[PDB]
Amino acid sequence: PGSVVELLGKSYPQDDHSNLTRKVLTRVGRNLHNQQHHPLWLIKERVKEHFYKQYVGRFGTPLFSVYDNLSPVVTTWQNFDSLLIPADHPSRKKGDNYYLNRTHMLRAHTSAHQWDLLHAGLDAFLVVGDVYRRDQIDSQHYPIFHQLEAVRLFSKHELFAGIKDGESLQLFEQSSRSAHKQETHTMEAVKLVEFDLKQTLTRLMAHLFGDELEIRWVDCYFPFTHPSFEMEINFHGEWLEVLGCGVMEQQLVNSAGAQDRIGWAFGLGLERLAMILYDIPDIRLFWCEDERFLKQFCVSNINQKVKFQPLSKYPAVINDISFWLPSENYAENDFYDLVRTIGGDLVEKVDLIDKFVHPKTHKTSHCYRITYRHMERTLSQREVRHIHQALQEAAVQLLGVEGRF
Ligand SMILES: Nc1ncnc2c1ncn2[C@@H]1O[C@H](COP(=O)(O)OC(=O)[C@@H](N)Cc2ccccc2)[C@@H](O)[C@H]1O
Ligand SMILES: [Mg+2]
């Protein structure tokens, strides 16, 4: 805790919202997506190449300008309001975000840059960068990850260029919103935009994975797009979501200054995509510096297919930790941050297995099961005991929990 936070050369006063941890701080600026030979950098480059090739290959395809070095520090307005996210939306909870204060935060998604880039007059761009979220702990979640945003605008004439009387067709109208379109969009326009969005993503996936992947489109919701979809890839017998997308909400596009255009946007999870593409078992591997892992991604050309050889999996050490939550003062993700700070990448996952209220005291008891497993070696019972004891004491000091164990 403190009164002022210094980050990337700037100073931010603290308030009731401030909840950034020093641990997260050490990762800001690391930019793995810009680190030559890093798997995330690799994905980013192969995605860029795909878009370049399509630009040079099809007259219709616009040139996408790429922004992969935008500061992750943004305003709540950039991250939330510009995207039409309601003031009472659960995605704004202090429990799920790293707020520097009430006005600034570490972006929770690359969509935080849509409005600004649109406002600058760009028709097609990609944003690649580290995003931050407070979440649970397991092999598929990390406080920091990366996304790649894409935005593509269409003018009326351009969208209907391939149709005879196309110029008599329109992008906008004044009807009602349905499951298939916004209230100011015509179905003619939406059908073409949606088709372009899905075809583009399908071609990008074919380029990255080959024409053998099994994908499916799932209808979903986002305040900033409509209709909206999630694309899922069937991997290891399970359908996994790898991206969100949809037709951009017109209110957003209009407020940025492009009131004469209609467009689509998407945001893909790079780690999610990389773990499927290279069969990487644990997200923590992206942050280790073990050459056994990293050396495998140093290719001659980004098109050199890397055959990822999984590292050995070492034994885990499991310990439980129980304590009484402070009298009406505590958050699950708060404990998760403390674990990331003390246990670092030694912890594989934390599971809240039990919770109950004591009648006499009125206090709530929480019991978490902590799985300790190092991605690079075998952990000794000894070093785990010490890390675990430090977690217990810290929990009592910072979280205000009462050691129940
Ligand atoms: N910690 C994590 N590490 C890796 N992948 C994660 C993590 N948390 C979630 N994911 C995966 O990321 C996919 C989505 O991220 P969400 O954060 O869920 O969506 C978004 O972040 C939206 N901004 C996407 C978007 C952009 C533009 C237009 C429309 C929609 C999820 O389906 C999920 O499987
Ligand atoms: Mg998504």
Side-chain angles (χ1 to χ4, degrees), residues 222 230 243-244 267:
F222 293 111
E230 271 165 353
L243 69 83

Side-chain angles (χ1 to χ4, degrees), residues 260-286:
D260 54 313
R261 307 304 181 71
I262 186 172
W264 55 241
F266 68 70
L268 53 86
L270 299 178
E271 282 88 345
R272 186 69 164 191
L273 212 55
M275 287 171 76
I276 297 178
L277 177 65
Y278 306 124
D279 207 313
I280 296 170
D282 192 300
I283 197 169
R284 286 173 299 160
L285 282 177
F286 292 111

